[model samples]
Target: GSSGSSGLEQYVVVSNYKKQENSELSLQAGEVVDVIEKNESGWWFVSTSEEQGWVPATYLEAQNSGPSSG
Candidate 1:
């Protein structure tokens, strides 16, 4: 569950994502991904292993940031 990429940061997959098209990336829960591009439409372009494509932002969360403490 650990890897590296030259993106903005790493994020953890909070949801199991399935691609609706060839332009999308499919990933499983608990998987780690490198966020390459963040879109304003809530879909983010990420890279994992040899795959790179768009995924819904709702399916990811910043790793180790944890929940709100307030």
Candidate 2:
């Protein structure tokens, strides 16, 4: 799951993401995204190929910064 939407490109998303947001972020895999500064519970501020909003951190398999991104 990846996203290049909302004119934001700060992070990256991979794998499968299923939810009621941006219809899959106009992407299935491989796309640079913007990771906003938000970490609540397990969700993160992310902009994907489909939508620009908070996505679950579980989607990011390998994040080398910070403990979370919600």
Candidate 3:
């Protein structure tokens, strides 16, 4: 992810995600997020436009372009 200008690479939420454990996240469909990391538990540490936490990789996707580039 680039920082000073064009911005960082992010993840796009597909199915609505809700992690039950502590330090987890609950995100809705179509939400854009920054994927901080993907751990061994098949989960991703992500930060949304409003909040940040851990989410399952099973319900996430990546975009070819940044939000609303088109």
Candidate 4:
């Protein structure tokens, strides 16, 4: 019964990335993505458009969580 906030963290691509495997995500500089999972190996899972796959954490920059609410 642990139901926490499910809002996905957002990230912005800072560098170009080409997927080397089907499990990886191809990224373009300046593209925005939703980070779904983080791995200790430095690769993170992200979603963009209709595609979702692993991406390098270094290629992404975290965005502000969201607007603060009272």
Which should have the higher TM-score, number 2 or number 4? 4
Model 4 stretches with alpha carbons more than 4 Å out: 1-6, 65-70
Q: TM-score for every candidate vs. truth?
A: 0.77, 0.50, 0.68, 0.77
Each candidate's lDDT (Cα)?
A: 0.85, 0.58, 0.77, 0.87
Model 3, span 1-70: residue lDDT tens: 5557445558788987666866777788988888777799897788776767887787788677555655
lDDT of each residue in 3-53, candidate 4, tens digit only: 985789889999899888888778899999999989999988899886889
RMSD of 3: 5.4
lDDT of 1 by residue, 5-68 (tens): 3437789999899788888888999999988888899988888886888998899988866677
Off by over 4 Å in 2: 1-9, 21-27, 61-70
> Higher-TM-score candidate among 2 and 3?
3
Model 1 TM-score, 2 decimals: 0.77
The 10-residue segment of model 4 with minimum total lDDT is 61-70
Cα RMSD (Å) between model 4 and the true structure?
5.0
Residue 26, model 2: Cα distance from true site in angstroms: 6.5
Better model by lDDT: candidate 1 vs candidate 4: 4
Predicted structure 4: lDDT = 0.87
RMSD for each model, in Å, please? 4.9, 7.9, 5.4, 5.0
